[PDB]
């Protein structure tokens, strides 16, 4: 029993995380087999911050202006290179605690664990989801650019994040392990802010699974309805459409506890228009969107790494 | 900015974790230097568990009879001992992976990181705290036994909690890693309960104060209270008694913000008079007590919003 917000072991990822220096700023690398991987604005000042020309930023750098240290270590750069919004920095020992990893570019809803780091040196992990507005809620200070957001699938560390920015609302932005942004996010400081953000239906969804689950049942209903009649409700409230593919990863919660995807929409449709009337589920007034159904059967059930 | 739910990173746990096998029950262990220690409930059949008699059933154990697995690896036991309600199990070798630690004791209301695992093996990381009653609100499913509870405050961890069990309201009990229960519990399959929980005080003051860093003042008030008519008032929503102690704790949280304790604590008593109004503070619709005033300062920028 219990039910908490619950990240991945974060051992894997620690001993990849490495300070990179370049000149005046100091924030966080993922050091990869001989690669280093760090967000590419770690090479501008403020002033170049304010519309820089990456390309030129770094065609003014030499190897021995980046500074790595692992630990009390420091690693040479023997070359450097950028894709999209992330420098690789090429360094002459490969880690020997590199794991088995993948980088993998996760859709909005999915969620991940976020090892925050301050100078190569991990601080805290917590668990989050992608926004659909493409942000990330997270607890982020100055210094934790570099830090990374990870799910592990059996021994495979699948990379999927790296903290770039924060934007004026409190909320962050950040890049795959390819440098590419989630969401309509440049790396300048310029006015950028994040779209209007909604609930991640399908989260909610198997988080309501996962009350039934632990014991929580107030909310079932006799009702059941159509998955059209569901949507136009959650146009209503701002929540995600859900579609036949998110009814379909429910089932297996859906065949546990006996409560039709469309009849635990009914249950939905009744918190949104009705509210919780005082009471609470697993402990929240909120309807929780930051567990996905995989994490639900994975935490009901106990998986390992 | 930002205000999460954060562990502490696992990996130095993570490498402690070992399989504990005596008969035909496996649980948790930690390895550290050449001992393991686990719950002594190991070497209990489900039978044994209304009335065991450890020091007997444990004069029957050979050191043989205790499978102890890390990783791929089975590690030989050397010798044995019980410490209240803990097992302590000699190996042959010392645990290359043992971090800087200490056994520290906590008290009601401090907060600590819980690596659950199942067969010696992590499956997720989640933050805690010991409630007023001495139960844990964990996520254990039957084989987490022996999963741990830690804080890492530098690169020393501090281990406060070993799970032994469920209690009948799906909430947590366990030891210290001396094998002494937090709260009027035994590892007996006896009628226990948990007493009255409430809610933790200062934790909910320290939360306060996060959220007035990170900007949000809608629940401030221009009154003050005394702590007596603060108690008086708080005692009726089941709160802590806030004492002394804890005012002088909130003592820095209070400088920074410029919002005097008992001010703070006027602004909790319309809180709880009013409710939230379907407002948030920190993204919740509930007043949050994981957080204690040390976290609060450790998580949140040094610099008001
Ligand atoms: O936004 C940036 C840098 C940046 C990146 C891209 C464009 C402009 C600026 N860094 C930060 C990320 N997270 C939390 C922060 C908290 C306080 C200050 C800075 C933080
Ligand atoms: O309580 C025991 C064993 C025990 C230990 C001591 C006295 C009686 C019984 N084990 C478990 C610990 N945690 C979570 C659980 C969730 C489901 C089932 C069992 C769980
Ligand atoms: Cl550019
Ligand atoms: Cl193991």
């Known amino acids: 029993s219990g039910f908490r917000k619950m990240a991945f072991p974060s051992g894997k990822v620690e001993g990849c995380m490495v300070q990179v220096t370049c000149g005046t700023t100091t924030l966080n690398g993922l050091w990869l087999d001989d ?6 604005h770690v090479i501008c000042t403020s002033e170049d911050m304010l519309n820089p020309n990456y390309e030129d930023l770094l065609i003014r750098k030499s190897n ?22 992330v420098l690789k920095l090429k360094v002459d020992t490969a880690n020997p605690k590199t794991p088995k990893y993948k980088f993998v570019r996760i859709q909005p809803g999915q969620t991940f664990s976020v090892l925050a780091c301050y100078n190569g040196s991990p601080s805290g992990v917590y668990q989050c989801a992608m926004r659909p507005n493409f942000t990330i809620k997270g607890s982020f200070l100055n210094g934790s650019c570099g830090s990374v957001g990870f799910n592990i699938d059996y021994d495979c560390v699948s990379f999927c994040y790296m903290h770039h920015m924060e934007l004026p609302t409190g909320v962050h932005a950040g890049t795959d392990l390819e440098g590419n942004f989630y969401g309509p996010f440049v790396d300048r400081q310029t006015a950028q802010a994040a779209g209007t953000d909604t609930t991640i239906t399908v989260n909610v969804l198997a988080w309501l699974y996962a009350a039934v689950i632990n014991g929580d049942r107030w909310f079932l209903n006799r009702f059941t309805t159509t998955l059209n009649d569901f949507n136009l409700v959650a146009m209503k409230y701002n929540y995600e459409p859900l579609t036949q593919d998110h009814v379909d990863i429910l089932g297996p919660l859906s065949a546990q506890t006996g409560i039709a995807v469309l009849d ?19 402990g929240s007034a909120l309807l929780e969107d930051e567990f996905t159904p995989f994490d639900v059967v994975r935490q009901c059930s106990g998986v390992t790494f």
């Open 35 to 40: 690669v280093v991987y760090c967000p590419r």
């Open 264 to 282: 635990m929409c009914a249950s939905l449709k009744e918190l949104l228009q009705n509210g919780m009337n005082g009471r609470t589920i697993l």
């Open 64 to 85: 021995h202006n980046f500074l790595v240290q692992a630990g009390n270590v420091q690693l040479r750069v023997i070359g450097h290179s950028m894709q999209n919004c």
